[PDB]
Amino acid sequence: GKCKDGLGEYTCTSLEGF
Amino acid sequence: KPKLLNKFDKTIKAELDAAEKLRKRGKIEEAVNAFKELVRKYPQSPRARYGKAQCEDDLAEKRRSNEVLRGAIETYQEVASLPDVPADLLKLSLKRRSDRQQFLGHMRGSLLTLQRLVQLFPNDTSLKNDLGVGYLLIGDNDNAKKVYEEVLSVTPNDGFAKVHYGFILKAQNKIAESIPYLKEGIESGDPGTDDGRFYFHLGDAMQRVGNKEAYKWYELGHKRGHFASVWQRSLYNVNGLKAQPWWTPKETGYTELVKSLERNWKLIRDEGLAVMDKAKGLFLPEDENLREKGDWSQFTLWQQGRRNENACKGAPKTCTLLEKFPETTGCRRGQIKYSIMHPGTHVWPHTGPTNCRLRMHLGLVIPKEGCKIRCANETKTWEEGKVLIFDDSFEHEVWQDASSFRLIFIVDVWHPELTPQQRRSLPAI
Numbered sequence A: 001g002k003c004k005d006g007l008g009e010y011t012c013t014s015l016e017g018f
Numbered sequence B: 001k002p003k004l005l006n007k008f009d010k011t012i013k014a015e016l017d018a019a020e021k022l023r024k025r026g027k028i029e030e031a032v033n034a035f036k037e038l039v040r041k042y043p044q045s046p047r048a049r050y051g052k053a054q055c056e057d058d059l060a061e062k063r064r065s066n067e068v069l070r071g072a073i074e075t076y077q078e079v080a081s082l083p084d085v086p087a088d089l090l091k092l093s094l095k096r097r098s099d100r101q102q103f104l105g106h107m108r109g110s111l112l113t114l115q116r117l118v119q120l121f122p123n124d125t126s127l128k129n130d131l132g133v134g135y136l137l138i139g140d141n142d143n144a145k146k147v148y149e150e151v152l153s154v155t156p157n158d159g160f161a162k163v164h165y166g167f168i169l170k171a172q173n174k175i176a177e178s179i180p181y182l183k184e185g186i187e188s189g190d191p192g193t194d195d196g197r198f199y200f201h202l203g204d205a206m207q208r209v210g211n212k213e214a215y216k217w218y219e220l221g222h223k224r225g226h227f228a229s230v231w232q233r234s235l236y237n238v239n240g241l242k243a244q245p246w247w248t249p250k251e252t253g254y255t256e257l258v259k260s261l262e263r264n265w266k267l268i269r270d271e272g273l274a275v276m277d278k279a280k281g282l283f284l285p286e287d288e289n290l291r292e293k294g295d296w297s298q299f300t301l302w303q304q305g306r307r308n309e310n311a312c313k314g315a316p317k318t319c320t321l322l323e324k325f326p327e328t329t330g331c332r333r334g335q336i337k338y339s340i341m342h343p344g345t346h347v348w349p350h351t352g353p354t355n356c357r358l359r360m361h362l363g364l365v366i367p368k369e370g371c372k373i374r375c376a377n378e379t380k381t382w383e384e385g386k387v388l389i390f391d392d393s394f395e396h397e398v399w400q401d402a403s404s405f406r407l408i409f410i411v412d413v414w415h416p417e418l419t420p421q422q423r424r425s426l427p428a429i
């Protein structure tokens, strides 16, 4: 899921290394 | 303190230390060649293999290379496959392997590594906690919940497990049950519990149940550096951006965008109504547990700065209009979306994830009475054909007590003080 209006996810970004 | 040398490695300790000294001195290229020579000469040495992996790790940092880091991740696993690997070294190597896998976004790979660590060290509670984070990062709250239940069954006062268990309960809308776990976990002061997410959700859980103590935790989270203020509680921030709950168009500098929205508001309205009438399934119910009650759905045209092509087939003139404004279409920390809300709807007080956007609301169909929005200490109403602008990183709250539907158009823009360099490099949200 994604943080659109709120902040309900454990993380709101996706890790892509450097 | 840690025991990293097996029987044979102790006999070659002088060569192992000379290679590691090169790494600590920042001579990474000489260090990788020294450890590759040790791995050549002593192919079974776990310490030499771990040195090779640590050097590749350092080289990945120096070059900012994902490919070099992928090499390190494999060599960390090789350490674990060698004969007679000391337990401390085995744990260190696989723990860094999982950490670097997560850094690259290999969440499935990290999960396997964490599962192997728990299998190899069944008495290490901290590894089970790390596995629970692995599940949380991949979105598997059910397996994460099982892991922390296993941790709390043996170590009931593990504060790290408590805050994560409470987080999961809260995310499942078990609001009352989550409060003691979040509260006791933060109060435990265990490493990993002093985290903005747990202050955020404890205070919000308390607000939903009417616990007046909520803002004491917001103040403490602010005191400990997790929040810009007790009002502005976003967690993905760029420090120093002008912070105020309500903005005028002139204050934002986006007056050309606002004029276009207000001059052309009827075409935006008409396309939204046509979707309501002929393609209602494009409106998707809000799914972030932000409603106390009622009905609230959104029809999204852009998200994370990416146009939804099928959605723009449903509002082609609106998408054509907005494409002239990269300050919103390129806002990778915001959306462009229709938002319909029906009577009997109360949206809990809540905060968006980032201070890097400002949120515009264009009124499309606004009932004469019963609809209002609070941001911080100030409540306002929409007007058809007019734009409101607020910073939704401040706590905000919405009510819909009209006798018919309320339709608005939401347009997120980059915070105006973010440079073009920051707008291209910030991770999308």
Ligand SMILES: O=C(O)CCC(=O)C(=O)O
Binding pocket: A005, B339, B340, B341, B347, B359, B373, B392, B396, B398, B408, B410
């Ligand atoms: O009023 C709406 O439709 C959405 C309100 C809200 O929470 C937001 O725009 O962030």
Ligand SMILES: [Cl-]
Binding pocket: B249, B250, B254, B255, B256, B258, B259
């Ligand atoms: Cl204007």
Ligand SMILES: [Fe+3]
Binding pocket: A005, A006, B350, B351, B352, B392, B396
């Ligand atoms: Fe909101």
